[PDB]
Design a protein around this ligand. Sequence first.
Ligand SMILES: Nc1ncnc2c1ncn2[C@@H]1O[C@H](COP(=O)(O)OP(=O)(O)O)[C@@H](O)[C@H]1O
Ligand SMILES: Nc1ncnc2c1ncn2[C@@H]1O[C@H](COP(=O)(O)OP(=O)(O)O)[C@@H](O)[C@H]1O
Ligand code: BEF
Ligand code: BEF
Lengths: 62, 399, 18, 749, 195, 163
Amino acid sequence: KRGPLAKIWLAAHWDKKLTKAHVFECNLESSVESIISPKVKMALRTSGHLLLGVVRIYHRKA
Amino acid sequence: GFLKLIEIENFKSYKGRQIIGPFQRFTAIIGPNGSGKSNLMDAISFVLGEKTSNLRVKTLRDLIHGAPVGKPAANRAFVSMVYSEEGAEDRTFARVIVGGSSEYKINNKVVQLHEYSEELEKLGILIKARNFLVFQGAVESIAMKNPKERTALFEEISRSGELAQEYDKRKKEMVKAEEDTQFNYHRKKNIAAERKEAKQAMEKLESVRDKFQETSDEFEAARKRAKKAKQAFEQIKKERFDRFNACFESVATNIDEIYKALSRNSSAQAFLGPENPEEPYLDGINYNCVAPGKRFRPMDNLSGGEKTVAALALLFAIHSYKPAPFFVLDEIDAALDNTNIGKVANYIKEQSTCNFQAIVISLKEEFYTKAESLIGVYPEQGDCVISKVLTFDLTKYPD
Amino acid sequence: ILQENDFGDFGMDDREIM
Amino acid sequence: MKCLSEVVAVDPSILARLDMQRGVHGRLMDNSTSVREAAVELLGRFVLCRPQLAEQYYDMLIERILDTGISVRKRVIKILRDICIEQPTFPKITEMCVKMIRRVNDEEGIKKLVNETFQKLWFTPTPHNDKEAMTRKILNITDVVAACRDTGYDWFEQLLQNLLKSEEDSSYKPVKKACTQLVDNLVEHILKYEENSGRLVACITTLFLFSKIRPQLMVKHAMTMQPYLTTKCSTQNDFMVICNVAKILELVVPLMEHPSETFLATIEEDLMKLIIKYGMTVVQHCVSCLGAVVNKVTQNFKFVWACFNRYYGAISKLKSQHQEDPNNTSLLTNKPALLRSLFTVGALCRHFDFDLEDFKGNSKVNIKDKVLELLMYFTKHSDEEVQTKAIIGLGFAFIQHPSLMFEQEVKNLYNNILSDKNSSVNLKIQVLKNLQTYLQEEDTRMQQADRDWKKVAKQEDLKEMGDVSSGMSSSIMQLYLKQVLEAFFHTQSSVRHFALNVIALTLNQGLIHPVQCVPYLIAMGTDPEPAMRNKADQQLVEIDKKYAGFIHMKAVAGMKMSYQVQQAINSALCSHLYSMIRGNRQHRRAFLISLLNLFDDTAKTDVTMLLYIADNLACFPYQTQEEPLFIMHHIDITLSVSGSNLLQSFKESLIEFANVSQGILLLLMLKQHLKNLCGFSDSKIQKYSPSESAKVYDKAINRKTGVHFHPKQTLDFLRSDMANSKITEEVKRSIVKQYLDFKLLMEHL
Amino acid sequence: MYIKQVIIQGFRSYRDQTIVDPFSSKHNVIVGRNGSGKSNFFYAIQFVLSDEFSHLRPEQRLALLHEGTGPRVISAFVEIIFDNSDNRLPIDKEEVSLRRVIGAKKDQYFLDKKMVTKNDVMNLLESAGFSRSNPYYIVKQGKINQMATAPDSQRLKLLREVAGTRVYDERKEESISLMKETEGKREKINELLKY
Amino acid sequence: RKYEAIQLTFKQVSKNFSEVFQKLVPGGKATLVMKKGQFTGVGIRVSFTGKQGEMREMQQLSGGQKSLVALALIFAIQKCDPAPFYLFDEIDQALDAQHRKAVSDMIMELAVHAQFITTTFRPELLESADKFYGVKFRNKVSHIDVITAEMAKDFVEDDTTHG
Ligand SMILES: Nc1ncnc2c1ncn2[C@@H]1O[C@H](COP(=O)(O)OP(=O)(O)O)[C@@H](O)[C@H]1O
Ligand SMILES: Nc1ncnc2c1ncn2[C@@H]1O[C@H](COP(=O)(O)OP(=O)(O)O)[C@@H](O)[C@H]1O
Ligand code: BEF
Ligand code: BEF
């Protein structure tokens, strides 16, 4: 919907609206993992969903 | 007659030898939680004999007093009952256990398992039945049983269970005789065919018609073998069929009238459905009843009270076929209101007085308000619990 | 030609009720 | 098919070539959904592009509506909706328009698409212009509801409720306004009718259905058709109009606000005149509305009470005459008056209880006991139609108080009338009518009393759960249902019509056990009338959706009951049983094992049951390969054993021989016909063994044309038998000729 | 939190459950006679919230309609209304309603007149803290005592769910298989890169 | 980070289990022992009526003893972190009136933590409740409404008749 992590929300939860354009170059995986590592107020299950998003997009790049 | 009283030694919070009171036609065992009361039923089943798991215990060396904590009272335990019957005689049976070994006694002399088993059968006690002693949370399961096990219970109560091996043996030589006969039939039909195109040398034709005659004689021998086996399998099915169906039809009848009797109503039905009713002792038997005031639904959907109704109906019907001298009932007033407990209490008051002894455990005061004697038990502290017995008369009170 | 069909409509005869 | 459907949509002038006609017909009757929707889409595109010359194929089109698919029915609805919307005045529209409302309740999606289809088709706002369009819309609706009468009305009112619930908020109330815009126009139609009676009764049934759905409209028009209730001729449709307007006022008078007292009064008296000068059916359907209006607002029930007293005094005079004079001719003179008195007292008992503190108004005499005792006394009468009228009065009085059947002698009345092979057939019909009606009013009253729970919620207790008020309704069946079982074995078919209706509505209420009457329901699934077997299979599959093994329990009992049914009468009749049970391998295997062994080995049954068993066996539609293979294998086993034994005994050696040889011959002929019909090599039959592998013999069977030669030959050899015993030389020649045929069949390969 | 009210139409034993006085935030007691038809409340709300009861055969789903009298219902529903006052529920509103519409084949979820892809309810209730698979905090009629006698493996599973990491296992073994197959793919990439 | 979260929540649950145990059981102590872990089991250890001399296992108990074990674990998690809702279907079945008094007292102890809803056949439990909800089954159908304290207290225990 809105946000740098919104694409990861779509990947974790919807995964149908994703296209090849976002998959190829929209974000660096190594960047976003270190973005998400020190974040405050991070609930456990939402962290699991963000892990879903990053694992899914990494395997899609592969 | 009935069971007079029970004697216990070094078994489940019962130190030493204490004489439990004489048992009237309907008494009760009442006490708060953890008072050590179901163990009395456990001892009843134990002297009757049953596998350890259902007594919430394993390895049968834990049954001694003090063993669940870890320090046994001793390596030595007696349990003993006295059966009282008319004609002024009483029969004193006992079970004698040391460590992991146990034996049986009648009139305080060593009695082996087998003869003990058939004489208690002559008393009227099927120890493979288990259809008379009640567990904590099994009354709901009675209706919710997989039909296989209740089918086996009805099959054994028809005294045919030991005949299962002979029946299945005769069945397998049925199928073997049939396959041998048809195999010979196919083989001689092939021989007749190839001889038919052999007709269109003479020496090989005569040799192969000799082989045809040999195959015909072999098939005839198979026919005599199957014929001899046939009538024997006929009487074996006839006897098992007769025993089982007579049992089934009497159970079906008496459960119908007792079910319509017990719910004080004319508007409920109960039925026991046999799977493959031509020979249903081998296949399952389901059980479906109609509620007093509810629509016809599957029995998995039911609440507790109507399952208790159906279970006690089953119990009283199979009593009405094959009586048990006395009954033990674990807390059958589970989730009921005052009306249903009044129903069952009035039933057992009118029905125990000339058909059966019956003893219960409960907490709801109206159920044993109708009782005529009461067995209190007080638990006591120490290194472990020691429970103590006292008896209370009830047949000297108004209304 | 009548290759792949039902035997009449006997496989297909759910009737109307009242 | 889809592509060539587009091709013929471009060029309709090709649909004459015969091979493609055969292909499209075969795809209409192909065993798959998608080809069926492709072919019906082809035909529908042909119909829309070419309205003419397709009505000859319209019968196939209209029979493709019911196809047990999902998208096929949507497609055919689209086709027929466009047919209706593009060409009016087609000669078979309204009949057409019946059939799909019959499918409105079938699925949720069909329910929707049909609802807005007809809402755009019929129920649009239609502003104050174009009177003729509204006029033939009204005409079409009347033709639909007139054609609706034969089958049943519940479907269309269910549609009406579907539209009613669909607009839960305001949403401008588009149908609702249009709804009243319809009804007064219908009244206007009546206002211009003024003189053809079929169209009048169609209009009054339209008003009837509109009253059934919701009674909020006709409160202003009651006095407009008030003169039409007053007095008409002696014609039956007028009587139906009288019944219907009585029902309509019965609904609408409770809702209309602040009525005129003298209006209700004069309605009351004129409808009592209609009682005293007309037949029984109008009297019932109007005493309903009299009881309603008397016991709904007003308080002048003393006059109707006095009318009851008059009829009671008259029937007291008649019974007192019959006390000492059972042969008095004075009773015959007023015998129809006695019948009318019986109907009147039954109806007055029926509508509401007058054995109360206000209708009597004095010390309680318990007049209900006296009237039931007197009706018992009148039931034992020499003439027949007086006993018919007595049973009518019994049922009507029993409507109000069900505990009255709990008495023993009432049960004696039923079981003595229905059993004993009673010469009269009618009395069974009326008593079963009473049972069916009884179920109907009790269902309706409990359903309506569910709706107004809030008005009675706080004046009733908790600890009781008043259930015997419902339990008695159940309990009465355990008194007589078993009796009803031998009621099923009757030559007359109106008897079985009512009996099946009773048991069907019973299990629809389901206060009885399900699988107790199934072999009867199996047997009368073999009835010549389609509605009978229709309801029978429908109820069977209704259980089958809900309980699995229950019909599998009742397997051979249905066969014996069916044999009894075709005694009562004097392809496979019980094929639908096989159609349901075709899934499970084990239970079907067990059933065929039980059949083939028990009824063909040793049981000395009548040959005729086995004849019709083998008839069905050869005539069951089997679908995969393995089942006839298993049949032939166990046939070969049992046949080799029994035939070898029988031939060796006859060679050693006889009417019993004739019967058992006839049964063996039956088995040979069934085997031979099945082996011809399957068209399979006998060597593979020899190779087969039971339960080899599940996945090997699943192949599709081909059925060849005109193979059914088993019933003719079995009939020939049974007419050769006829269970005949005589000492002629010709019967010995027949025996030895059949023995030679046995030797030949023994020798076949 | 706090359940406001419940609405039932045609579920198992209620034709039309109208609007009644709301519940209390502390404790609400119910008493009835034997067979009162109360387990309908339990099965209804667990059907609204949990997924596992909607996993068995369609036959009893068809038998999961109130078939009392009159017409045969095909379409039922159950609605539940409550307040997300503490905003434990992530949607920002104040009277949140969840209703489930039930057909013979059909089943649809409405959250305040919105269509759901059946995954919004799962992660939504997970954010709320609900477990669709637990026997925790909900007990059947006469099934209260197995959980004490339930052996230790599901005790560890229970405490693992209490930790909230009941997700992380299925996530990680979902990851590992894809990880290994991508190892094979990238190893293939290296030999072909040499090619 | 999940691993030590397991450790901390296990300590929190085991300490809450022991304190709710000593609240409900007037005399005796019971708590969790963690096995060799990785982790493969967690045992339950209860001592009562001597409180040290008694030492028992999982399976040989009374019904009420198992009930109080279960309810103690229920509020071991509840006090560790409350679930949003709680609901009981005759939770007071095997237990006696004294512990029915106990469990109702911990209902009033815990009512601020979470919303509890419960159904029973026994009267002592229902004096720990805010207001009263009544079932009504008539005309082959069920319905819920609101009722009062007094007539409900009459229905549950006072009226002892055929209906
Ligand atoms: N041999 C024994 N010595 C002491 N206590 C025992 C012994 N066997 C069981 N107990 C304990 O006694 C308590 C009472 O329960 P139990 O004797 O099984 O009967 P009930 O279920 O009727 O209370 C339980 O806590 C049980 O673990
Ligand atoms: N599908 C259904 N249609 C109609 N009534 C039903 C249906 N399922 C259950 N019922 C009714 O609901 C009630 C359920 O009672 P029961 O299950 O014994 O109580 P509880 O819900 O307290 O366990 C019964 O009276 C039964 O007739
Ligand atoms: F009405 Be119940 F047995 F919860
Ligand atoms: F566990 Be108990 F005192 F029957």
